[PDB]
Amino acid sequence: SKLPLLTENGGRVNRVGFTRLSREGSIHKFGFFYEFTQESLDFDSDDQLK
């Protein structure tokens, strides 16, 4: 049914148009930490806690 079919009287028939889309992507920030006291690394059982 939809086949492009021409005749001898070639004219404004079978017009086609094209489309252009787009794809996005963002950037997000993360992070975490932890706190310690000098009284937790000075007199503590382990020497290499840090």
């Binding site: 000075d42 007199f43 503590d44 059982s45 382990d46 020497d47």
Partner: peptide, 8 residues
């Protein structure tokens, strides 16, 4: 000494 503790 450090890393020992708080009591002697």
């Amino acid at each position: 000494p450090k890393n020992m503790g708080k009591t002697i």
